[PDB]
Symmetry: C2
Subunit: 286 residues, 2 copies
């Protein structure tokens, strides 16, 4: 108390010794991550440029921007893992998971940056997209929100693990759905395949967050969690309807708003709480 | 000065943004690491037991203690990477390498622990070996030496990177040669195959340390480096001739002492200095 009464966070003199495994649930998630290892080089991008060139300008604009957003957000997730989560959690099985997540985030960032480089030849445009946190207003609200949770010296691990589940689970959900929409339109195999791998990985990262949350003795209240999750949903809805409208690629903004609330509800249930919006998933393709 | 004039260590606002790659040499080492990814599950240990059971009791003693030394030392290397190197180095390319090295060390540590579990069924003997830092006098000198460099609040990155290159390159060298000796005897293919994979990784980790060292503006002196390396050599020689004699598996202690000095010279040259001992490699199998 405050942290000595938390198995996840309390002193572990065996933290750097791997065996024997004591948290089999946590360990199995690390094994799952390790088993689905992939590299950017495995994704075949050789059919994408033709499809990219056939797109309308506004579609290319939307796609390049979603890519820039993902690449930038990964860096924030990564920073939080490197500076906070991988340091403060003292159980070996979780340290292994977080260590592997850091490695996978670098691969995700590389994949996005390689997609940018493949589609966008102009070096000034590449640089613009790489520096999205500073160059792109659409990205700011989400980036600032995530970064505040890294700098927050008060917020408990319980609150911060929820916030990052919201980053990887709510902040990414609209953009993931967007690319699955492109798949439904039969467009850009490399983008859509890499999107399958990455959203799968991110789903696993959110599942892990929920597992860690359940292992906590002093959780934040349902009220506090609702508050964090609702805030995140509103930011994500703003991003997809105002800052970078999904209309640009032919999607229904109204149904997209509903999808984000469905996603949040599922996260809430997975965190062991009650649904908040009680809406259906409007997308058959998700 | 003192850190703000070091490109590896000075403020990098772009540190969590992956592209563009600016340090292509550092980046290529990360790509090499990434391309050689493997998991313990790829190593078949099933054909080892028969050979294991045919050894003399003191050969089994020697091997299990080497395994336990390796698993323990992995956790110290890992601790240093997690708490220090991956935090203090500000260039993205090296941060990616170190992130991937943390993951691989966890895989090494699992491999060593699985080798132990496979060869040793007795749960008391397993626990003895997993807790080697506390239970096994033969590892104390190396463990303490390595751990001092993590806790040293005054030593420079330049001195510590050398120290950990000595850990991964000198403290491991005799044990790797021990296992390569077992291969020459045609014994235990699982052990010796995992040893090939791990020694190769550790070789890369040492190469990376040398690359980082070359990128430093303020390096420690040749004399200071010599002192660190010579000290490491003496400790390793003690380990292999006195604390856990390689005689126990039919190797010559004098030729082993000479091999360590050869390894140290090669590292000295790789660091950009002169030879120290000027001895040949006594082992044709290395
Ligand atoms: Na442990
Ligand atoms: Na960078």
């Amino acid at each position: 108390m405050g942290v000595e009464d938390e198995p996840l966070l309390r002193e572990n003199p065996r933290r750097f010794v791997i065996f024997p495994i004591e948290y089999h649930d946590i360990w199995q998630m690390y094994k799952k991550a390790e088993a689905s290892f992939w590299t950017a080089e495995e994704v075949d991008l050789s059919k994408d440029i033709q499809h990219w060139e056939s797109l309308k300008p506004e579609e290319r604009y939307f796609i390049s921007h979603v890519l820039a957003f993902f690449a930038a957000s990964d860096g924030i997730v990564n920073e939080n893992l490197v500076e906070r989560f991988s340091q403060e959690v003292q159980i070996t099985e979780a340290r292994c998971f977080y260590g592997f997540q850091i490695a996978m985030e670098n691969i995700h960032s590389e994949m996005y940056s390689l997609l940018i480089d493949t589609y966008i030849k102009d070096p000034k445009e590449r640089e613009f997209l790489f520096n999205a946190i500073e160059t792109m207003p659409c990205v700011k609200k989400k980036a600032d929100w995530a970064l505040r949770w890294i700098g927050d010296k008060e917020a408990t691990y319980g609150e911060r693990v929820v916030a990052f589940a919201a980053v990887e689970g709510i902040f990414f959900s609209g953009s993931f759905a967007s690319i699955f929409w492109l798949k439904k339109r039969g467009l850009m195999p490399g983008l859509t395949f890499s999107n399958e791998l990455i959203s799968r990985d991110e789903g696993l990262h959110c599942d892990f967050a929920c597992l860690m949350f359940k292992h906590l003795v002093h959780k934040p209240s349902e009220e506090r969690v609702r508050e964090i999750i609702i805030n995140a949903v509103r930011i994500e809805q703003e991003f997809l309807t105002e800052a970078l409208p999904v209309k640009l690629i032919g999607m229904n903004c109204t149904l997209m708003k509903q999808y984000i609330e469905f996603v949040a509800d599922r996260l809430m249930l997975e965190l062991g709480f009650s649904k908040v919006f009680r809406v259906e998933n409007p997308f058959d393709f998700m």
